[PDB]
C-alpha cells in the first residue's frame, strides 16, 4: 500500500549543497502531497544499503540517493532497493536512474570564462578525489585547459570545507603565483578568498576566483562570488517529478541531465595589468 | 534495532544542519539510527512531522524547532508515550537541552562595552523565533545595565542577504561604531555591506556574530562570534534521550554554556 512518503539518503548535511538539495526536495514533495523522511549517511555501499532497508521496512514509496558513488558501488545500492523506485543524484556513468547536473559542463564553463578574459596561469583546487563529482570536475578542467594548450599551474585537493580552501590556497601561494583559481565548490572558494586577502593579493585585480554551486551565501561573499550555478530548486523539482513518474510507469534506467550556468559577480577580471589603466 | 526521530527547521540554515550532523554522530556511536523530518514554522507543521516520525516507529524524538512552550506542550501531547526532547523552547521545559538563551547576548554586549563602544546597533533574527526574541531581549537588558539604548534595531531573517540589506538600511539612517548580529550568516552579509560602503571592519565598525558556524573562521575578516557548541548539543541531547528511554524520570532543563570566540572583527571605537 502506498504511504505518500519519499525516503532520502544524503551525504553530510553540514555541507551547504546537500542541505539545499534536501530543502528543495522537501518543498516539491510537499506540493505533490508527499512527506520526506531523511537519512544521513557516510560513504560506502554498506552505509547506503543499511539506510535503504530501514526505509523500505517502513513502507516508503520511493527513494532518492544523494551520496557520491562510483559505478560499481552505485549498482550495489540500486540492487538493494529491490523494486522500490530509486534515483541517484551523484554518480559516475552508471546503469542506474540519475538526475544530474552536467559534470563536465560546469568545468568547461569555468575554464572558458577565464581563458576568454585572457588568463594563462590558472590553478585548480579540487574536491576530495574520493568523490566522483570532484574527479569529474577536475578532469573537465584539465581537458578544457588542454584544448587551449594550457596546463594548470597548480593542482591542490580540498575536502569541500572553507578551512580546506584556505589551507590549500596558502600552500598554492608558497609554490607559485596564478592569476586565476578554479575552485570545486563555493565553501572552499570562501577560504581561498580569505587566503588571497590575507596574503596581500587583491581579488579580482590580481587573482580571479570562480566557485561552484552558487549556494545561498555566495552572493554575499567579499567580493560577491562568480560561480557555476547548480539550480538546486530545479533539481528538487525534477527528482521528485521523476520519482512520481517512476511509480506510475516502472521504466528502464536512464541518466537525465540538468543545465548549469555561469553566474558572473565580482571575483573575475582580466589578468593583472593586461589592460593597465 | 533503535531509531531516533529528529524534527528540524529549514536545513538550508547552517546551525540546524550542524545540529543534525552532531545528533547523527552521537546516535551512530551508540548504535542508533536517525530519521529526519524537515518542518516549516508553526505547531501544525511540527505535529505533522511528529506524526510522520511516529509512522516510522521511532523509539524517541528530538525536536529542533523554535516553539513557545504552549505549542511545545501541544507537540509533546502529539508524541504520546514516546519520549521527546526539545532544543529550542521558551520557557525551557523539563527534559529539554538548550544553549543558555541570554548568556550569548550578555557576552556580546559586555565585550563591545569593554572595548569602549557606546553606539551599538542590533541586527535581530526574525522575531517570530523564540531564539531571536530572547537574544534581542538579552541585548537590550545588558545594554540597560550600562545605561545604554541600542542606536538602531534592525530585523533580519537569518540569511546573509537579509544581513546585507538590513545593514545597508541601518547605514542610511545612522552610523554605529559596533553591530551585534543574531547569527553568523547575517553577519556575513553585514560585513559585505560595511565593506562596500567603505567602512573598515574593525577599525571603523566592530561586528559580532552568533553561532560560530563552520565557515565563520574564514570570513573576511575572520568573525568574532558567540560559539554554540553544536557537537556538545548533539552529544548531550542524544544522551538525555537515552536516559529518558532507560528511566522515564523527568529531569530539569539542561542549559549548555556559550562562549565568546575572539577573532578579527572587533576593536575599540574610532576615537
Ligand atoms: C552537489 O555536488 C557537490 O556535493 C558535495 C558533497 O558531496 C559538495 O557539497 C559540493 O559543494 C557540491 O558541489
Ligand atoms: C540555533 O539557534 C538558531 O537557529 C536558527 C534557525 O532556527 C538559525 O540557524 C540561527 O543561526 C541559530 O542561532
Amino acid at each position: 500500500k502506498q504511504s505518500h512518503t519519499i525516503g532520502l539518503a544524503t551525504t553530510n548535511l553540514a555541507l551547504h549543497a546537500p542541505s539545499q538539495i534536501v530543502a528543495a526536495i522537501k518543498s516539491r514533495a510537499s506540493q505533490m502531497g508527499f512527506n520526506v523522511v531523511i537519512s544521513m549517511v557516510e560513504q560506502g555501499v554498506e552505509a547506503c544499503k543499511a539506510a535503504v532497508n530501514s526505509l523500505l521496512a517502513q513502507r516508503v514509496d520511493g527513494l532518492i540517493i544523494n551520496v557520491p558513488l562510483e559505478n560499481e558501488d552505485a549498482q550495489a545500492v540500486a540492487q538493494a532497493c529491490g523494486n522500490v523506485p530509486v534515483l541517484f543524484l551523484d554518480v559516475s556513468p552508471a546503469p542506474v536512474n540519475s538526475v544530474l547536473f552536467d559534470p563536465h559542463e560546469g568545468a568547461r564553463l569555468g575554464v572558458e570564462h577565464l581563458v576568454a578574459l585572457g588568463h594563462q596561469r590558472i590553478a585548480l583546487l579540487t574536491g576530495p578525489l574520493t568523490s566522483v563529482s570532484a574527479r569529474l570536475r577536475f578532469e573537465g578542467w584539465r581537458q578544457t585547459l588542454a584544448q587551449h594548450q594550457l596546463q594548470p599551474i597548480a593542482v591542490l585537493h580540498g575536502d569541500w570545507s572553507a578551512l580546506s580552501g584556505y589551507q590549500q590556497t596558502m600552500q598554492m601561494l608558497n609554490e607559485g603565483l596564478p592569476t586565476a583559481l578554479l575552485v570545486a565548490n563555493d565553501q572552499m572558494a570562501l577560504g581561498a578568498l580569505r587566503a588571497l586577502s590575507e596574503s596581500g593579493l587583491r581579488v579580482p585585480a590580481q587573482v580571479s576566483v570562480v566557485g561552484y554551486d552558487d549556494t545561498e551565501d555566495s552572493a554575499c561573499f567579499i567580493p560577491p562570488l562568480t560561480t557555476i550555478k547548480q539550480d538546486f530548486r530545479l533539481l528538487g523539482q525534477t527528482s521528485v517529478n521523476r520519482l512520481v513518474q517512476l511509480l506510475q510507469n516502472p521504466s528502464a534506467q536512464s541518466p537525465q541531465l540538468l543545465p548549469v550556468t555561469l553566474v558572473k559577480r565580482k571575483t573575475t577580471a582580466p589578468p593583472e595589468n593586461l589592460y593597465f589603466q
Side-chain angles (χ1 to χ4, degrees), chain A residues 2-277:
Chain A
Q2 288 223 288
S3 58
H4 291 284
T5 297
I6 280 153
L8 168 55
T10 179
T11 185
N12 182 20
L13 289 169
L15 292 182
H16 299 342
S19 274
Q20 281 189 233
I21 288 167
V22 171
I25 287 174
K26 193 265 178 187
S27 177
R28 182 65 179 169
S30 291
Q31 287 166 338
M32 296 303 96
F34 281 91
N35 288 320
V36 181
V37 165
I38 302 140
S39 179
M40 174 170 166
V41 315
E42 316 313 319
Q43 311 276 251
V45 183
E46 213 64 33
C48 286
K49 285 191 307 199
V52 161
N53 303 126
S54 58
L55 302 161
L56 298 213
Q58 295 312 328
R59 300 145 301 170
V60 311
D61 301 326
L63 302 154
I64 296 173
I65 315 284
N66 186 25
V67 181
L69 300 163
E70 282 333 287
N71 186 49
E72 310 217 53
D73 284 353
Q75 299 195 44
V77 166
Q79 177 172 231
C81 310
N83 286 36
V84 175
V86 58
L87 304 188
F88 295 77
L89 303 189
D90 198 12
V91 287
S92 58
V96 304
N97 290 305
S98 60
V99 179
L100 289 184
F101 289 109
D102 178 344
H104 169 92
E105 179 66 5
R108 190 190 76 76
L109 286 172
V111 170
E112 291 290 330
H113 175 71
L114 293 172
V115 164
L117 285 167
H119 290 274
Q120 298 162 351
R121 300 148 43 199
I122 298 164
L124 311 176
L125 171 46
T126 79
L129 289 190
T130 53
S131 158
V132 47
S133 272
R135 176 180 63 80
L136 289 176
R137 289 168 199 180
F138 168 62
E139 288 168 14
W141 286 334
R142 185 181 59 195
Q143 180 201 9
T144 307
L145 286 166
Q147 284 156 21
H148 293 277
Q149 301 192 332
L150 300 167
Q151 296 174 293
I153 192 171
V155 179
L156 294 97
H157 316 289
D159 70 9
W160 301 125
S161 72
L163 182 61
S164 83
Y166 171 82
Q167 293 172 348
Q168 295 311 307
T169 298
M170 273 330 261
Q171 192 64 70
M172 182 194 72
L173 296 173
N174 281 323
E175 289 331 311
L177 188 65
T179 64
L181 182 58
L182 290 163
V183 190
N185 82 338
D186 289 355
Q187 289 186 259
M188 294 191 298
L190 179 74
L193 291 175
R194 175 184 164 226
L196 291 163
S197 177
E198 293 184 358
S199 302
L201 289 159
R202 290 170 281 114
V203 174
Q206 299 179 295
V207 179
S208 290
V209 180
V210 183
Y212 207 115
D213 280 341
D214 198 28
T215 36
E216 203 81 49
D217 294 336
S218 305
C220 287
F221 291 1
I222 294 167
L225 184 66
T226 296
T227 183
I228 304 307
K229 171 168 198 67
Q230 299 194 115
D231 186 338
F232 301 120
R233 221 65 199 180
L234 168 63
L235 178 61
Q237 312 183 267
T238 301
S239 51
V240 171
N241 291 344
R242 171 70 171 165
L243 203 54
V244 178
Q245 188 191 1
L246 270 183
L247 284 169
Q248 271 254 8
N249 272 311
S251 269
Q253 312 321 290
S254 164
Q256 177 180 153
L257 289 179
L258 287 180
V260 293
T261 54
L262 173 72
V263 180
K264 290 175 168 197
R265 294 198 179 103
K266 289 311 177 151
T267 57
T268 73
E272 201 179 355
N273 298 146
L274 187 47
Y275 303 114
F276 183 105
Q277 289 162 55

